[PDB]
Each structure stands twice: as structure tokens, then as C-alpha cells.
């Protein structure tokens, strides 16, 4: 029965309240911090894209097509459909001998307002390349092509790619990922509900290598380093996931998920983080991931300060007037 | 007292996300017909109570002096998309008070509606104060001031005669105490007074019924509610919940959204007022919750009930158009 994790104030008062759950786990699976119910299956949605990109790396497809940090970042991305994202994804497909028509994710306008205005002014309609999951889906197609697997139907539950992804995520998290746990994601691929505890543990393991074979440990290390090295390619302009990974370069891994999921790691402390705003609000998940991270940087005041700017964000109206704050509650203390 | 789960968002076989909330349904006499959760704790009505804020426009006689039909009264009660028709009409309402866009103190922003925003972006460098979802309410405020020879400059300020009047009107409609402690600044820079959901609902029941109101306030309230139901495009716009909900049973259902997951409603013919809040402020929950609450009163009107249940239980389709799960008001709305 989940505690209030974020308050949203106006004048002297709380106007809105979010409840959520948080799991912080080390490489060995030891629990360092928890809020609310970390045992009920939650859909990680986009928060677990890095786990899904392991096939791209472990298959040798990354090395074969000359993917560096930018390409791997995109594979792990919910991007804004900025031209830089669109041209990188086209490039990943091109090097595999494919193009946009291979994408099975469908098209949508940026979920960033500033980026949508630019799209609206430069395009008649978005393409599948503008889909926030185009880099992941381009990873998928590249993984298939490299291995001589026809990418057609790569979204299918019993396509060999999704078979491999399910086995990989079972191994990382120790969760049972089958029909019971399964739903269709925004891009038409499977997403697998699992306890927050197991999702945090999966991330701790990618972060530490603990419990993984060398190949999976190495491929996990490359994916995380790539996201922290090219955080723009994970999200883009004005995005929480990009800015959070610019506070302490190379030290903090974060990834947003649809419906208020966040995953994080701090490799150097060997911890994985997962959390869920019960109502699925993004603003709550952002404030909660910042408050949770800040616990581990209390001794580093400029990093703590930067994190607290997301844990306690001012809101201004259309005239620029401060009206209240979105703030993580004292349960983070 | 903890708020019950009012809305579930499903994916595959599971609940993906849950919203908690509160609902009050009150008649003209203040009798409670239906409630969920805490309807006693102060909540900010935000734009949900624009119809009450429009009383000075009508009761001053400003609406009649400036030739306002149902469209102008609807816009005055509106959180509109900033479509061409809303922008022109706001501009007309100001023009009749001897004013223009510079008179507006609400500031500018791009459309609440994505499709309208794409249109705005393609045809404008930046939006003006006229494009602001509250520009009709603000044009009304300025017109009420100009008609009475009150200087509209600083019309947003707490002790400006308009704001003093709005507090007095809203205390009379709601029976709520609206002072400094309850006050916040709204998205449009005017005051917004947190009050119990029960008091908000009662205020709408009284506008809906005339019960407890002096003849002039009773008449002015009937005019505002009628205009909103007569011209629901002007209350919101293309694609909008508020417009579509008032096109289900033309002239019979009043609704209005508020920022942070508020809805207010009335069904004048059943003598009832409705208020509600998604505790987490989610629009999608408040929409599901107002549709389920309205549906309770139309169960034997199968076309209307079905049309309302299309908002209370709604399929989610992904970018490829595949059904992935539902946004559904829970069963506490049937019990
Ligand atoms: Cl996105
Ligand atoms: Cl392994
Ligand atoms: Cl650093
Ligand atoms: Cl003008
Ligand atoms: Cl009265
Ligand atoms: Zn996706
Ligand atoms: Zn307003």
C-alpha cells in the first residue's frame, strides 16, 4: 500500500500527490533501500531498453556495422525524434542494407513540445524513424541481419529475436517472463511485468557483472558506458534522462519508462535502482529517481545540489510567475 | 481518510497504473447523492469553476451592453484550444470593451490540443495572449470592468474590485471561506481558492437549479450554463473531452475540466452538481471519472449511457493501432 513519494504544491497547500515504490539493490541482490510494494509485477516499458539491446552487442552486430557510443545509446533510447536521432537510425538500418520500411514500430510526433514545433514546421507527418523507439528497433533489425535472420515480424512473441530477448531478461533479473506477465508495448513489441526488486537486480548485475558470464558482463558494460557517454542519444533536448547523466559524467546511468518507471545504476557503488509512480506520472518518476540518486551523493555537494534541482522542481505559470513546486517527500531522507 | 482507486490503466492481463480520487454529487439543497473519497479537504478548482467566475460579466450587465450571445458566454467559461474561432472571438469581446490583446494579463502559450498546436506552429512564429486557454475568461473580466467604468489594469490582483467581487460571489455560491490561506496563483496569474469538493459541487447545483440564489444570480447562472451546453466548441474545442461530453445529450449535460485532474459538472434537469479530483492530477483519470459519474444518472438512456461509458472505459491503441489495454473507471462508480 504505496507511500506518497511526490507532492505538487500551489500557494500554502499540496494540490496533487503521487504514490510510488522504489527498489535499490547491489550486484549480489542485497536490498539497500525500498519504498512501497517492490514485489508486484510492474511493466518496465522503455526503462529496460538497455537489456533489450544486449542481442545487438552479444551477436557481434554492433562491431560488424561499426556501431560506437552514439549508435548503442540510440539502441537504448526513447528519443525526441530530433533530426540527429532520425539520421543516426537511418544510418544503422542503411549499414545493414535496410531502410525505414523495415521498421514495424509505426510513426508519431515528438513527445517534447519544443521538438514537436520543429517537426511540425519541417515535416508533413512523422516517419517510423521519428518513433521514440526507432533506435531500439534499428538495433533489432541490425541484430537479425548480421545473423542472417529475416527481420520480418521481429516484433512477434515467437520471432527468434523476442525469444532471445526473453531468455536474456530472465537471466539478468531472475524473473519468469511468459504469457501471464506479457503485454504489447507502445511500439508493438512484448513488455514483461516483473517485480521492481528483480528489475533493480537486473540493472545492478549489468552495472557490476556479478552473476553474469563474461560476454554478457562485457556487453552490459559497453551499453551502460555508451548511454553515459552519449546521453543526448538516449533522449535529447530538454529531457530528464539526458540532463541527469550530464551532472556527473560517466558516473550515473538513468532511463525513463512509459507510465512513470525509472531505472538507474551507479556502477562505482555497485547498485541498481528501479521505481514506479503508481499513477504513471513522468513528473513523479523524475523527482523520485533524482531523490533516490541524491541519497548516494550526500558527500558530493555539487552533484547532490544538481540532483535536488530535479527532486524539488519549481513550477512557473505562462507569465513566468512561480506558483509552486513538484517535490519528493521526506521518505527519501 | 485514504482515497479509493477510481481509475485503472491496464496492459495485457494486468493493471499497469492506478489513480485515486474523490467525487461529490450534491443537489440544490446540499443533499449528497453520491461520493467517493475525501470531499471535505480543500482542493484547487483551477479552470473547473470558470462559469462561477463569469457571473460578474453577466450580473454587471456587461454581457448585454456588449451584445454577447451564447458563444461569448461559452468562451468566457472556456479553457479553449486557441483555435482561429476562439482567438477571433476573444479579440471581439475585448474590442467591444474598447480594448485589445495588450489588456490581457494572462500571457501566451501553445494549444492544449496537439493537432491545433501543429496548425499554430505552421502558421505562427509564437502564440499571443489571445491563444491562452483563458483568454475568453480574461476578455470577460476586462468587459465586466470596462462596462462599470472600473480600470481593468491589474484586474488579476487580489484586492482589485473584480477579484473582491469573485470572492464574494464564490463564497455565496459555495458556502466555502475563500481567503489568503486558501489562495494560490493560477496558470493565468489570477487567484485560485482551494475549497472542499462538496462545497464546489453544491455551488454548481445552485447555479444549475437556482436553489438558494437571488433572482439575478439565478438568472445569470442559468444563462452561463445554458450558453456552455448551447456552444460547447467554445468551452474547449476540436478533440476536447468537454465539447464531446456536452454533444452527447445536447442542452442536458454541463461539464468543465480543471488543470490537475479536476472536473465540475451539472445535470440541471436532475437538480445535481458534480465535482471531482484525481488525487495525482491526471487529466485522463478525471475524464474517466466525470464520464462514469454522469453515466450513473443516465443508465436507462442507453444511447447516452453508452456514449458516456465510451469515456469511462476506453481502449488504448499504440502507434500501429493495436488495442494494448484500457483506461477504466473502477466499479465503485456502479456501487
Ligand atoms: Cl518519448
Ligand atoms: Cl549470463
Ligand atoms: Cl565525472
Ligand atoms: Cl487585439
Ligand atoms: Cl445569491
Ligand atoms: Zn519501445
Ligand atoms: Zn485561468
TrEMBL record, chain A:
Tell me the keywords, alphabetical order. Metal-binding, Zinc
- Which top-level group of life is the source organism from? Bacteria
Residue positions where Cysteine sulfenic acid (-SOH) is found in the record: 241
Residues recorded as binding Zn(2+) 2, renumbered to this chain, are 133, 187
Q: Where does Zn(2+) 1 bind?
A: 133, 136, 185, 187
Detail which positions bind Mg(2+).
Answer: 148
GO function terms (MF aspect)? metal ion binding
Q: Which Pfam families match?
A: Asparaginase_II
Name which cysteines form disulfide bonds: 133-187
The record's InterPro entries line, in alphabetical order, gives: Asparaginase_II
Q: Does the keyword NAD apply?
A: no
Q: What is this protein called?
A: L-asparaginase II protein
To which species is this protein native? Rhizobium etli (strain ATCC 51251 / DSM 11541 / JCM 21823 / NBRC 15573 / CFN 42)
Show the taxonomic lineage: Bacteria, Pseudomonadati, Pseudomonadota, Alphaproteobacteria, Hyphomicrobiales
Amino acid at each position: 500500500t504505496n507511500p506518497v513519494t511526490v507532492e505538487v504544491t500551489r500557494g500554502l497547500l499540496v494540490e496533487s500527490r503521487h504514490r510510488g515504490a522504489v527498489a535499490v539493490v547491489d550486484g549480489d541482490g542485497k536490498l539497500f533501500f525500498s519504498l512501497g510494494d517492490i514485489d508486484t509485477a510492474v511493466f518496465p516499458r522503455s526503462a529496460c531498453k538497455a537489456m533489450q539491446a544486449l542481442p545487438l552487442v552479444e551477436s557481434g552486430a554492433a562491431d560488424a556495422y561499426g556501431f560506437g557510443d552514439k549508435e548503442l545509446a540510440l539502441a537504448c533510447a526513447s528519443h525526441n525524434g530530433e533530426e540527429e536521432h532520425v539520421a543516426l537510425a537511418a544510418s544503422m538500418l542503411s549499414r545493414a542494407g535496410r531502410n525505414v520500411e523495415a521498421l514495424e514500430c509505426g510513426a508519431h510526433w515528438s513527445m517534447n513540445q519544443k521538438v514537436l514545433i520543429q517537426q511540425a514546421r519541417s515535416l508533413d507527418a512523422p516517419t517510423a524513424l521519428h518513433n521514440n523507439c526507432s533506435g531500439k528497433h534499428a538495433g533489432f533489425i541490425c541484430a537479425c541481419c548480421h545473423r542472417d535472420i529475416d527481420p520480418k515480424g521481429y516484433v512477434g512473441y515467437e520471432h527468434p529475436l523476442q525469444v532471445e530477448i526473453r531468455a536474456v531478461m530472465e537471466r539478468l533479473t531472475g524473473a519468469v517472463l511468459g504469457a501471464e506477465s506479457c503485454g504489447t508495448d507502445g511500439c508493438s513489441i512484448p513488455t514483461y511485468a516483473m517485480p521492481l526488486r528483480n528489475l533493480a537486480h537486473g540493472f545492478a548485475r549489468m552495472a557490476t557483472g556479478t552473476g553474469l558470464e563474461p560476454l554478457r558482463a562485457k556487453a552490459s558494460r559497453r551499453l551502460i558506458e555508451a548511454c553515459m557517454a552519449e546521453p543526448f542519444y538516449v533522449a535529447g533536448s530538454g529531457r530528464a534522462c539526458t540532463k541527469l547523466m550530464q551532472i556527473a559524467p560517466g558516473r550515473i546511468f538513468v532511463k525513463t519508462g512509459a507510465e512513470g518507471v525509472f531505472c538507474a545504476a551507479i556502477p562505482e557503488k555497485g547498485i541498481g535502482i528501479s521505481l514506479k509512480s503508481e499513477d504513471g506520472a513522468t513528473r513523479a518518476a523524475e523527482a523520485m529517481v533524482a531523490a533516490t540518486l541524491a541519497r548516494f551523493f550526500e558527500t558530493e555537494e555539487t552533484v547532490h545540489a544538481a540532483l535536488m534541482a530535479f527532486a524539488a522542481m519549481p513550477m512557473r505559470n505562462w507569465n513566468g510567475i512561480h506558483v509552486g513546486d513538484i517535490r519528493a517527500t521526506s521518505v527519501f531522507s
